[PDB]
Amino acid sequence: GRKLELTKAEDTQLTKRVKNAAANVLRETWLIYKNTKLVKKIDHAKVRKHQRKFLQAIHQLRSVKMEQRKLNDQANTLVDLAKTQLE
C-alpha cells in the first residue's frame, strides 16, 4: 500500500493581485534604476519613495505566492484524505 507516502506537491482575485503587483515591481525597479544610475544628481527623496513602492510590490507578490502554496497544500490534504480509501 501507500504506507507513509503522501501526494507529491509542485483564482481571479489572486490573478488581479499578481498582475498589478508585478507591473508595480517593473515600475519601481525602473524608477529606482533611473534615479540611481541614469541621473547626474541623485534625488534621495525620489529614491526613498520608489524604494517604498518597490518593497510593497515585491512583498505583495511574495504574499500571493505564499497563499498559492497554502491553497495547494489544502487541496493536497483533501487528495491525501481521499487516497486513504485506496488502502
Partner: protein, 146 residues
Amino acid sequence: DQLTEEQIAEFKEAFSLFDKDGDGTITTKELGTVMRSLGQNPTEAELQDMINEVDADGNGTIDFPEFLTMMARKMKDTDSEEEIREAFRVFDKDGNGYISAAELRHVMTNLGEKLTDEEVDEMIREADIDGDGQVNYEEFVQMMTA
C-alpha cells in the same frame, strides 16, 4: 492522469467523506467542516478557491466527476522520510540527533493523541536499535520508510 476501475470505486467511498449530507454534492460548507476535522482552518475565500479549481461547470459545488477528474491530476505520491525526521527533531532538545527512550515515552504519553505506556514499549523496542536507551531518529525513520 488515467485512473483504473478499482480506484474509481474506492474514490466513491472517498466522496462520502466529503459529502456529509449525502445529497450528491460537496459545498464550501461541507468542505469547511471536513478541513476543520483535519485540524486546518481554511478561510471562506480559500474554501471557494478549492471548489473553483475543480468546479468544471461553475455551479458552485463539486460533483463526483469534477472530484474524480481531479484526483487523476494528482495521483503521484512521494516519500515522507524527511518530513517525518523533522517531526522527531522537534523533540531533539539538544539538537544532537538523539532522543532518549525516557524522553520519547514522556512525549508519547503526554502530547497529541498519545500512546499507552505499553504501546510506547513496542515503539521503543523497535526504535532503540542499539539497546542503548537512545533513539537515533534519523535511522529509525529511515527504517520505517524503507
